[PDB]
Amino acid sequence: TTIVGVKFNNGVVIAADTRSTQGPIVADKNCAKLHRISPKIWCAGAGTAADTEAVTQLIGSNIELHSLYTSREPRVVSALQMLKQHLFKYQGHIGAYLIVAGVDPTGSHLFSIHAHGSTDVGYYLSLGSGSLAAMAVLESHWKQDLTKEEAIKLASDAIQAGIWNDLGSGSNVDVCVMEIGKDAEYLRNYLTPNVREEKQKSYKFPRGTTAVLKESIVNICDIQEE
Amino acid sequence: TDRYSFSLTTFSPSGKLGQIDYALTAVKQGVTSLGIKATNGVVIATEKKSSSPLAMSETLSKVSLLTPDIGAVYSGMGPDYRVLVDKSRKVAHTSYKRIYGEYPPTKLLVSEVAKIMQEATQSGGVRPFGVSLLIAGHDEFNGFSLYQVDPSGSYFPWKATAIGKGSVAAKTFLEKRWNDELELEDAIHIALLTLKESVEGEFNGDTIELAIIGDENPDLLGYTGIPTDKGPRFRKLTSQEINDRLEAL
Amino acid sequence: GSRRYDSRTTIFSPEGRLYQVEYALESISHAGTAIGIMASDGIVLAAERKVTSTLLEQDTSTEKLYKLNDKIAVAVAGLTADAEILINTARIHAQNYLKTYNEDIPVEILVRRLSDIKQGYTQHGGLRPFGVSFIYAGYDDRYGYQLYTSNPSGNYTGWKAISVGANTSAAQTLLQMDYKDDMKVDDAIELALKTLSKTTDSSALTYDRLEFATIRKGANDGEVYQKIFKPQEIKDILVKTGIT
Amino acid sequence: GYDLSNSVFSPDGRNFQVEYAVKAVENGTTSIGIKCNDGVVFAVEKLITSKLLVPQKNVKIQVVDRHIGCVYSGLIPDGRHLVNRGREEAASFKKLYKTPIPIPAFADRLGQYVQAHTLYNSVRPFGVSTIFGGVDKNGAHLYMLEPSGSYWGYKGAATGKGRQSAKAELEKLVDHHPEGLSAREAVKQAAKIIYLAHEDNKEKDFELEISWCSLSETNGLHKFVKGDLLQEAIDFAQKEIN
Amino acid sequence: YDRALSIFSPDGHIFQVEYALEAVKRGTCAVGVKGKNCVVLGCERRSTLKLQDTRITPSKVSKIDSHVVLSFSGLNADSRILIEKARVEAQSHRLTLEDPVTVEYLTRYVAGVQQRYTQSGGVRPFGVSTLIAGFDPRDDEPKLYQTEPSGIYSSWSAQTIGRNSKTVREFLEKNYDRKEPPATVEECVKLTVRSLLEVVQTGAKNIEITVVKPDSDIVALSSEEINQYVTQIEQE
Amino acid sequence: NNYDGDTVTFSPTGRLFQVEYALEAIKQGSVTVGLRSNTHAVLVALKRNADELSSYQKKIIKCDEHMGLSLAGLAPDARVLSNYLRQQCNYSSLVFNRKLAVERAGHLLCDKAQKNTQSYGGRPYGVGLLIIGYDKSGAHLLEFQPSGNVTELYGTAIGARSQGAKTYLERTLDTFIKIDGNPDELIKAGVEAISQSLRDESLTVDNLSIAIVGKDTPFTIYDGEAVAKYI
Amino acid sequence: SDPSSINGGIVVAMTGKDCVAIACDLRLGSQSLGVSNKFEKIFHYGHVFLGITGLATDVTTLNEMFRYKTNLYKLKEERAIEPETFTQLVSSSLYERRFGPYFVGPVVAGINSKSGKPFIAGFDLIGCIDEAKDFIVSGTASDQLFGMCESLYEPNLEPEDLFETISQALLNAADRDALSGWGAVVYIIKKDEVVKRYLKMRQD
Amino acid sequence: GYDRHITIFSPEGRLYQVEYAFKATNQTNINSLAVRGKDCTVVISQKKVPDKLLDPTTVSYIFCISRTIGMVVNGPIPDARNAALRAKAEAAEFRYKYGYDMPCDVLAKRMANLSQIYTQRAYMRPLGVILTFVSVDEELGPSIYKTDPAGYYVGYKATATGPKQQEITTNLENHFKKSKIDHINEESWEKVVEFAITHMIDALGTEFSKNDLEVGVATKDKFFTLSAENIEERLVAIAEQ
């Protein structure tokens, strides 16, 4: 997988691909990897799939309390601190490689976070295995302070270079645009590239074309009264 | 040492647990609060009062969010509600959003909070929170439901109810005003009217706190683009909005 | 003073009897009548709520009947609050036995377990016992249907018919004169209701103040099917017995 | 009523038990502390109740870290237990921050502990007043710690029986020096007001013990004033009250 | 927590032991008679109230071992706690020492639960008294022990505890002898039935009998058997 | 009884009353007299039996070959403090290679007693110890109050009739301090001190137990015919 | 070896329209040895169906673990558990043993009873929600299954078209797998009746 | 009946123990007055210098919790230091675990919850200090929240504490009647101090020295105290108005 997060003047955009792998076998052709720490702090997860989801869920609960405890929008940096510490006690046994993006009232932020509790900041960050492929495109076309439309193009193309040179990345491109002082627009399936070509024949079989031994009915509604 | 591990609750000799009778007295020294369940929403209302006139009541909350579609409101002591609502939020997240990954049902949440009360009548160094809560909510499994949580640590579902020191007056008012089918708009007009007879302060929308768990709002959800996902059923009404409804009585 | 404020309520009295256990039985006479009758084809549990109001929602109220497992339900007579803690301990224990032996828990074991918890409160900690009385409807295949009452001391007594709560004596005299050892669930449903009609806590007995539940072996293949009637299905049986 | 513990509280806004414990300090030995420009000179009355005693061998003066003298009055065991606790605290600070603990910092830590025992019923309130201070990089300091767990900065402090004689003459001392006196001078002034405070203890007779921490005499370390210099002060004080 | 629920007395007593024995007094009546080839514990059963299903109702005699039985008097709540604990002890003698428990071991164990709650605080002794009896493995000697809620135990040839134990005790002075216990299973059983028919009365419905025979034989005598002894003794 | 059943209350008089009651345990108990010179410390304890069928009970416990304590109060309270003193004394040898200083062991002992008087469900221990030893600072004779307080003296006593013993020691105060290097003389003067602490209890040889410690003389307890030379 | 692929076991599941289907093989062995042909991997709690692959002891311990949890839920809310809440539960319980991890792949297949929507989800070793509404595969015939399943499957099948496709996909994978083979059972799961049908398969 | 000795309810629906905590804050006789400015929040408070042998600079009732949040404390000085320490500990905790300095609103609530837990323990007596927290946050602007020994807090336009604080409330209330807004508009922080002192002088009928006052000022993103020379300049300016 590849995850880009591109910061711009009026917000930050977080984008990912939907191909989920378990080994060289592709588990899912579509699965969103965009998870929700908060409705304004979306992240996506790369690396070990099981370790990203559960840890974004655990601190998602804790940040929801924090958000209720302050009665305002949580900060992006609050999510980053909860994550950093939790990973740090394991000393990197749990491999979470997230780009954490979000808006809050002090402005736009974009961070990346690694499995040990290492943290970096920048105006574009890329993580996962297709990260290399995305980064090249980004550094040519990026200028300081993009618009929303500009940034959406840039992010979506960066994942696209992910698709032809990384095999962890594939299928559709999702974008979620978070802007300051507005709702977040999850533009799921912003680009669909590679759809399956039509099969030569339809594999349909009449009845009794596979063998059966014996059948029966088994009813699973409820224990039945008389 | 610290040998307080003996309960501070004890049976009384004519039956009944003395400590929770004492806490029930604390509910009738507190403010007034009510809930009317409509068939297309719930309205909950309470009165705001201040320790100083220099205290802001625009930063004073007595209606709190537990989960987005579920609100709470108290009568009794301020301090006792303040910690206990935090614990209500906490147990919704530890035991159903870390296990079932979603916001808990209204029925379910109300039961869990009664367990918290129940261990504050057990053991030393604790005593029950002297509040009754109304937990209005909507879930997708039992519909709208309106509950009353007791300092006993018991709950009951209701159709319309009141708590506070002016509860008896309020529920007798509501006796004639409740019907099988209600509009949310009519529910609001009854709610403010019932609370007019139980509030000795101003009756402006500044000092009357109003919140509905009416129809959901997907523009307060904080994101858009999953139609499938629904936003807060709760909506707190700010002071000007409450004034518009006072003229519409 | 960390002993100057302790009164000692885990002690016996000069009689050999615990203060708090005696008082608990009083506070359970406050809660309304709850009845168990053991026919042979099932067990009828019938309880009349201890609160009613007309703005109270009684169509979703659970305040007497609770399922511990798919063959064992209880009626509650005492505090709802006190009973709740035991109800969830019960759920854990029943399922624990199913988890390890892959067999549903017999009625005996579960009843004994909750009783130990009640005795445990008086044995140590300085804790008060939860004043609950349960009437257990339970099925096992080894004794068939089993009926039990447990009291807040933590002791269990087998029964054929029994009542706790309000008007416990009255209810019992009605059961004694009318009981057959050859009663059906039908006979026991009518007996339960008529007994609640003489031990009623308003002046009229109403369907919406009744929780009524049965456990029936009529359900096919030898299964036991617990059905907790809706008040609108309790209404049907209230017209059967002609109260209404 | 309202003294049965310390989680009782009165409608008077007082805790009675804690006020009662100040009376134990009033039954103690006289002890003084003079805040000087460049240090502090403590002095404490050590009664001779018998000629059986061994002089200047029973210290009421225990040093903490190296630069904080602590001397007390009231119940002698309770104050030695207080100072044992604070010697552990001094060591922890030195561990973590690799520097000797400051005087305001040492005061705060002691104050929390004495403050804690007037809230718990499982642990008995203190019955000591301690007078402690010293020289660190933030100046000379002098602190008096009540058994209620209160302290302040002081230009002069006293506790014990004979604080009546001591306290008054410190008002004249500030009035002598409204910009304080030398560390040298304070040797003979700490001795002098134990000898005037020997008129609330004139039933018995006493032994003078003197200690100091000052920048200009010992270099900001707490040392005992001993030998000929201790005896020079005793000769001075002895003449004043005669 | 360790806030004494057992505390010393000005008479050199402990309060909870005096109260415990009275709690054993007001409870049910147990008689224990041992022959030369049996033990018999017959006990009082509360089933006075009708509509009680006596069959599924808890017994007054519970087997702990395949030839060690235990009966009880006092609180009915407390006794069941002990009976779970004893079962653990029984499996522990097997675990570390092999062989099923000796009567004498089990007597010291019940007493050791009582003992614990006697000296320490935060606990109080159970108001329970027991008659422990049975065989040791490869012995055909009857053992009859008694435990009391103090944490004390006594060996007996016959003993009775419970209500009007003195009436029964005096009756066995004139029938039973230490010197020559009954030489038959049935004679022993009938002597215990005769003693119970004084105070408990009220047929085989309140009267129970359990017999242990030497070396791993536990048999229970049904209501019908008990009734036949009753009528013969009544007539005689 | 207002504060007398509690160990955590003051006490409008600025006391705790428990400490005065712990002091009466010394009055009902045995008597022991200590006196020291520069080069020797001496304990002479009066051992006590229950009746004639009863032998006398040792009132001197050896803590080390340079340390000893004596009880005058209740024996089970002494049994707590004696173990703790012995443990911390072996510890000093083990860790610091040091003969345990008598003064410093007194201060550790003081604060130990204190924290059980502070705690509710505790008490101040009703034993007064006179603790002798010879360390690097010479001889010491300490007085242990029930409270915890240690005072250093050339001569002191605790028990019943102790007041008369201290009268004797204040008279002969400068005599026994100026006999140095002869252990025989200090012992003889302690016999006469505790003779003023008799009420016709009489000194015999199986009542009398002496223990000394010297500059070069180990802590040794004499009984039998080793005290018969000093009567 | 790997304690997941020591006993094998495989589960296939496919969506249809107004139906779902889950199927498994009956082969359960230890290493090279076939132990039983009398072992079913499909269990059900309400209208949710749980298939579980991988290590044997973890198959059976997790089967009773999920039974423990769903009993609690059912008694509490007094309603059947939904496929969506069951996923969340499975994800959280697998993540409990992150260290000393579980060695299984649970498979969730049911029909949402509040919309009539077929619903499936997959999981592997310590967790991971595998959102798809097409198919979810697990076990040591996964290579055999993902390929087979993708080609046969067309969206919006009927309960009976779904039966022919899922039977074929299982049969050919199981027989091109060594740790599967002995027998098969197929549940065809409708909104109202569940038919359980065994397949005659070649004994491998 | 021990409902005045341990923290259990009476049949009046009130905890007496808890009420007694409010009756200790009037015994030390410290008055405080706090107003919200336009860029600052100013709190002036009494300093009692009783003797010539107390050093007035170490006499404190203003504890600086965080970089931006002062706290003024009304009631006994033992409980004051215990509260100040706790408040600081939790604020540093919040910066550490959430990666930004603790807001005033949330700090009031955190101490309120622990004070309520101290009225729920029967072996831990509540701290008898009323705590005022003054700040200027950039998320709530200038703020005052006042917590009490019960566990109740509310926001304030202005607040006062002490025995004679009812007298102060009147003056402040009139001031906000005229402006018809909930904060004083004046862009110089110095002149908001001068207004604050005017309202205190009216209420207590006493003129002040520099060592009778101790002043804390929270400006935007910093909290500091005025030294004794600086306070005298403010009291000189009262006459200039």
Swiss-Prot record, chain C:
Q: Report the superkingdom from the record.
A: Eukaryota
Presence of the UniProt keyword Membrane in the record: no
Q: Does the keyword Cytoplasm apply?
A: yes
Cross-link position per record: Glycyl lysine isopeptide (Lys-Gly) (interchain with G-Cter in ubiquitin): 99, 198, 230
Q: Which SMART domains match?
A: Proteasome_A_N (SM00948)
The residue range of the signal peptide is none
Annotated coiled-coil positions are: none
Q: Which InterPro entries match?
A: Ntn_hydrolases_N, Proteasome_alpha, Proteasome_alpha-type, Proteasome_asu_N, Proteasome_bsu_CS, Proteasome_sua/b
Any one GO BP annotation for this protein:
proteasome core complex assembly
A GO CC term attached to the entry: proteasome storage granule
Q: Which keywords annotate this record?
A: Cytoplasm, Isopeptide bond, Nucleus, Proteasome, Ubl conjugation
Q: Where in the cell is it found?
A: Cytoplasm; Nucleus
- Subunit details for this protein? The 26S proteasome consists of a 20S proteasome core and two 19S regulatory subunits. The 20S proteasome core is composed of 28 subunits that are arranged in four stacked rings, resulting in a barrel-shaped structure. The two end rings are each formed by seven alpha subunits, and the two central rings are each formed by seven beta subunits. The catalytic chamber with the active sites is on the inside of the barrel.
Note in the entry: Present with 17100 molecules/cell in log phase SD medium.
Q: Which PANTHER family match?
A: PROTEASOME SUBUNIT ALPHA/BETA
Family membership noted in the UniProt record: Belongs to the peptidase T1A family.
- Could you identify this protein by its name? Proteasome subunit alpha type-3
UniProtKB/Swiss-Prot annotation, chain D:
Task: Report TM segments.
Answer: none
Q: Where in the cell is it found?
A: Cytoplasm; Nucleus
Report the family membership.
Belongs to the peptidase T1A family.
Record's keyword terms, sorted? Acetylation, Cytoplasm, Nucleus, Proteasome
Which species expresses this protein natively? Saccharomyces cerevisiae (strain ATCC 204508 / S288c) (Baker's yeast)
Q: State the protein's purpose.
A: The proteasome degrades poly-ubiquitinated proteins in the cytoplasm and in the nucleus. It is essential for the regulated turnover of proteins and for the removal of misfolded proteins. The proteasome is a multicatalytic proteinase complex that is characterized by its ability to cleave peptides with Arg, Phe, Tyr, Leu, and Glu adjacent to the leaving group at neutral or slightly basic pH. It has an ATP-dependent proteolytic activity.
Q: What else is noted?
A: Present with 12000 molecules/cell in log phase SD medium.
Q: Which interval of the chain is the signal sequence?
A: none
Q: Which GO terms describe its cellular component?
A: nucleus; proteasome complex; proteasome core complex, alpha-subunit complex; proteasome storage granule
GO terms for biological process? proteasomal ubiquitin-independent protein catabolic process; proteasome-mediated ubiquitin-dependent protein catabolic process
Name of the protein in its database record? Probable proteasome subunit alpha type-7
Cite a single GO MF annotation.
mRNA binding
Q: State the covered range within the intact protein.
A: 7 to 248 of 288
Curated annotation (Swiss-Prot), chain E:
The entry's localization annotation reads: Cytoplasm; Nucleus
Q: Which Pfam families match?
A: Proteasome, Proteasome_A_N
| Keyword terms of this UniProt record | Cytoplasm, Nucleus, Phosphoprotein, Proteasome
Claim: Nucleus is one of the keywords in the record: yes
A GO cellular component annotated for this chain's UniProt record is: proteasome storage granule
**Positions bearing Phosphothreonine:** 57
- Domain of life (superkingdom): Eukaryota
Show the stretches that span the lipid bilayer. Answer: none
GO biological process, alphabetically ordered: proteasomal ubiquitin-independent protein catabolic process; proteasome-mediated ubiquitin-dependent protein catabolic process
The family database entries (SUPFAM superfamilies) matched by this protein are listed as:
N-terminal nucleophile aminohydrolases (Ntn hydrolases) (SSF56235)
Give the family per the record: Belongs to the peptidase T1A family.
> How does this chain assemble?
The 26S proteasome consists of a 20S proteasome core and two 19S regulatory subunits. The 20S proteasome core is composed of 28 subunits that are arranged in four stacked rings, resulting in a barrel-shaped structure. The two end rings are each formed by seven alpha subunits, and the two central rings are each formed by seven beta subunits. The catalytic chamber with the active sites is on the inside of the barrel. Interacts with CIC1.
Question: What is the recorded function of this protein according to its Swiss-Prot or TrEMBL entry?
Answer: The proteasome degrades poly-ubiquitinated proteins in the cytoplasm and in the nucleus. It is essential for the regulated turnover of proteins and for the removal of misfolded proteins. The proteasome is a multicatalytic proteinase complex that is characterized by its ability to cleave peptides with Arg, Phe, Tyr, Leu, and Glu adjacent to the leaving group at neutral or slightly basic pH. It has an ATP-dependent proteolytic activity.
- This protein's gene is called PRE6
Curated annotation (Swiss-Prot), chain F:
Q: State the superkingdom.
A: Eukaryota
Task: Give the sites modified to Phosphoserine.
Answer: 11
Q: Where is this cross-link: Glycyl lysine isopeptide (Lys-Gly) (interchain with G-Cter in ubiquitin)?
A: 188
Q: Which InterPro entries match?
A: Ntn_hydrolases_N, Proteasome_alpha, Proteasome_alpha-type, Proteasome_asu_N, Proteasome_sua/b
Question: What are its GO biological-process terms?
Answer: proteasomal ubiquitin-independent protein catabolic process; proteasome-mediated ubiquitin-dependent protein catabolic process
Q: Does the keyword Cytoplasm apply?
A: yes
| An annotated GO cellular component | proteasome storage granule
Q: Is Nucleus given among the entry's keywords? A: yes
Q: Which UniProt keywords apply?
A: Cytoplasm, Isopeptide bond, Nucleus, Phosphoprotein, Proteasome, Ubl conjugation
Q: Where in the cell is it found?
A: Cytoplasm; Nucleus
Q: How does it assemble?
A: The 26S proteasome consists of a 20S proteasome core and two 19S regulatory subunits. The 20S proteasome core is composed of 28 subunits that are arranged in four stacked rings, resulting in a barrel-shaped structure. The two end rings are each formed by seven alpha subunits, and the two central rings are each formed by seven beta subunits. The catalytic chamber with the active sites is on the inside of the barrel.
Additional observations: Present with 7210 molecules/cell in log phase SD medium.
Q: Which family does it belong to?
A: Belongs to the peptidase T1A family.
Q: Which PANTHER family match?
A: PROTEASOME SUBUNIT ALPHA/BETA (PTHR11599)
**The name this protein goes by in its record:** Proteasome subunit alpha type-6
Organism taxonomic ancestry: Eukaryota, Fungi, Dikarya, Ascomycota, Saccharomycotina
The gene name on file is PRE5
